[PDB]
């Protein structure tokens, strides 16, 4: 309940998450900066894009324990869900995970994104997610 | 009074994973033009301005939302006057409630309940 949708001015990290589910059905998740991949995994057998997106976000939050984080998702679902903390339900597994992860950072901004930093960072994250998915066989 | 019933309803579309919601200026506009917004929820002190701008050499016209000039107006006022053309009922709200506060702090003070699921690809 310190959680804003617009950037913190004083942030140590500005991270960009993605989690595609691919055509061909393959699933990657990733966390990056504007220019460098931090964390990337392929996900269990053909899992949904919503589950990958949340995983990628829960994981950004985990790794930002005690830091000041701006993080960008492209997922309306992952952004919306995270912002309505204050509450049969689908992706329960991944949502509880996300709900506890929220409390780890010292400052948190979870921002939505559709050659500026935002465009490049989102791009970077989708590349790495869509590349840990294709060129990699799950666990 | 029932600010909280509507935003609660809005939040439930998220929480129930319906996909029948939108937020922010771009998704909401885009959704409005597909005939997809049933209720349009807007923060009463919404800060966004709608600028109508001229394109240099041309006698053409370009609109712009921000936070040579032809006409300027608050998007809220623009919504109030023009929302019925997407139909689309309109609910202006405030942040003096907890539901309304989260809407503004977390969803940018602008969003909608949707008739059907939209992509935003």
Author numbering:
A (entry chain A): 507 to 530, 534 to 596, 610 to 636, 642 to 666
B (entry chain B): 281 to 347, 367 to 420
Can I see the authors' text?
Previously, we showed that MoMLV utilized its RT to interact with host eRF1, thereby promoting stop codon read-through to make Gag–Pol19. In eukaryotes, stop codon recognition is initiated by the binding of the essential termination factor eRF1 in complex with a guanosine triphosphate (GTP)-bound eRF3 to the ribosome. Our structure shows that the MoMLV RT interacts with the C-terminal domain of eRF1 via its RNase H domain. Structure-guided functional assays suggest that MoMLV RT suppresses translation termination by outcompeting eRF3 for binding to eRF1.
To verify this interaction, we also determined the crystal structure of the isolated RNase H domain of MoMLV RT in complex with eRF1-C at a resolution of 2.8 Å. As the RNase H/eRF1-C interface is identical with that observed in the MoMLV RT/eRF1 complex, subsequent analysis concerning the RT–eRF1 interaction only refers to the RNase H/eRF1-C structure. The interaction of the RNase H domain of MoMLV RT with eRF1-C buries a total solvent accessible surface area of 1173 Å2. The RNase H domain mainly uses its helix α2 to interact with eRF1-C through predominantly hydrophobic contacts. Residues Phe588, Ala589, Ile593 and the methylene group of Arg585 in helix α2 of the RNase H domain form a hydrophobic patch that interacts with the hydrophobic residues of eRF1-C, including Phe291 and Ile294 in helix α8, Tyr301 and Phe303 in the loop region connecting α8-α9 and Phe406 in loop α11-β11 (numbering as previously described). In addition to these predominant hydrophobic interactions, Arg585 of the RNase H domain forms a salt bridge with Asp307 of eRF1-C, Gln559 of RNase H is hydrogen bonded to Asp297 of eRF1-C, and Asp511 of RNase H forms hydrogen bonds with the carbonyl groups of Lys404 and Gly407 in helix α11 of eRF1-C. Mutation of Ile294, Tyr301 or Phe406 of eRF1-C to alanine disrupted its interaction with RNase H. Likewise, single mutations in the isolated RNase H domain (R585A, F588A and A589K) of MoMLV RT abolished its binding to eRF1-C. Mutation of Arg585 to Ala would abolish its salt bridge interaction with Asp307, while substitution of Ala589 by a lysine would place a charged residue inside the hydrophobic interface, thereby destabilizing the RNase H/eRF1-C interaction. WT RNase H binds to eRF1 with an equilibrium dissociation constant (Kd) of ∼4.18 μM. The RNase H mutant F588A showed ∼10-fold reduced binding to eRF1, whereas the binding of R585A or A589K to eRF1 was abrogated. These data indicate that helix α2 of the RNase H domain in MoMLV RT harbouring these residues is critical for the RT–eRF1 interaction.
